[PDB]
Design a protein around this nucleic acid. Structure first.
Lengths: 49, 48, 48, 40, 49
DNA sequence: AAGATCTGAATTTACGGGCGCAACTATGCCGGACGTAC
RNA sequence: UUUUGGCAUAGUUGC
DNA sequence: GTACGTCCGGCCGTAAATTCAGATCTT
């Protein structure tokens, strides 16, 4: 479940310490058009930090 | 704490009860302040 | 051209370096639009 | 020169601040130093 | 046994590894689908870099 | 005159705020203990 | 014969 | 006897606080 939850919700770190966990790493794949799917799969996120 | 005083229980446990009650009322009105840690709902989420 | 003076018109089309520097230039337009929208209302709500 | 303007300056004017970004004194002269560059 | 690891689609361990387009059609999988995502509770999840 | 005090005047942490709304999605809080059946 | 509803999040997107 | 299985207990602006120079008292 531990991987599964983290991939299901996109909260990364300890599950019980999700208050300070980095969020939005895993996202539901955007299936609207093939270009959007490819663009989503080749995506980089820069956190604020 | 009520049943402690009805029983006439010890003083240190009564003081601990007063401490926890102070924390509980303070985080019931305001669950954010630079004091004791926040209150969670036993589900890993802070109380509003 | 080294420091980002693009000499072709939009009709003539920009070269690769010119195109990249133009994208860099327009990025500030997008960002300052974003921060303007971030400051929309705040000054206005404080004033009202 | 370079002086702060736009919504930062308007912010500071309404958000009255002890620290200006670009504090200045547009100071004028009255004697012959007004016209004499050397004396200025 | 110690658990279950989610498998990125069309990786070296997904069942669609190195399958021709005909077999992908027989499994009702689009041969143009690039893969690179997990299936968690049926939802397609992609990890943003 | 000297002092101690001592009382008003220069330097360090620490909350606490941080666009209008729309729209859509997707995910979410156990382990001992006691009985009953087979 | 007259109902109806999860709350708080997180992400994405429109002006 | 064994296990299961399901029912009960655990940035910047104030603003306070710390240290240094008159001043009356103390000596």
């Amino acid at each position: 479940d531990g991987l599964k939850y983290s991939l299901a919700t996109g909260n990364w770190g300890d599950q019980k310490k999700a208050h300070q966990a980095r969020a939005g790493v895993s996202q539901v794949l955007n299936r609207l058009t093939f270009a959007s799917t490819l663009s989503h799969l080749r995506r980089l996120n820069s956190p604020i930090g | 704490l009520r049943r402690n005083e009805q029983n006439g229980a010890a003083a240190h446990v009564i003081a601990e009860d007063v401490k926890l009650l102070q924390f509980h009322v303070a985080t019931m009105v305001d669950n954010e302040l630079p004091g004791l840690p926040r209150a969670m709902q036993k589900s890993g989420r802070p109380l509003k | 051209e080294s420091r980002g003076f693009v000499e072709n018109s939009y009709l003539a089309g920009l070269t690769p370096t010119e195109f990249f520097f133009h994208a860099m230039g327009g990025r500030e337009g997008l960002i300052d639009t974003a921060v303007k929208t971030a400051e929309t209302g705040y000054i206005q709500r404080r004033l009202i | 020169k370079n002086v702060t303007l736009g919504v930062p300056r308007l912010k500071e004017l309404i958000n009255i601040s002890k620290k200006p970004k670009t504090p200045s004194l547009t100071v004028f002269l009255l004697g012959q130093s007004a016209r004499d560059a050397e004396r200025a | 046994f110690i658990g279950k690891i989610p498998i990125m689609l069309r990786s070296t361990y997904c069942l669609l590894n190195g399958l021709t387009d005909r077999d992908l059609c027989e499994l009702n999988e689009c041969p143009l689908d690039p893969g690179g995502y997990f299936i968690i509770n049926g939802s397609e999840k992609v990890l943003i870099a």
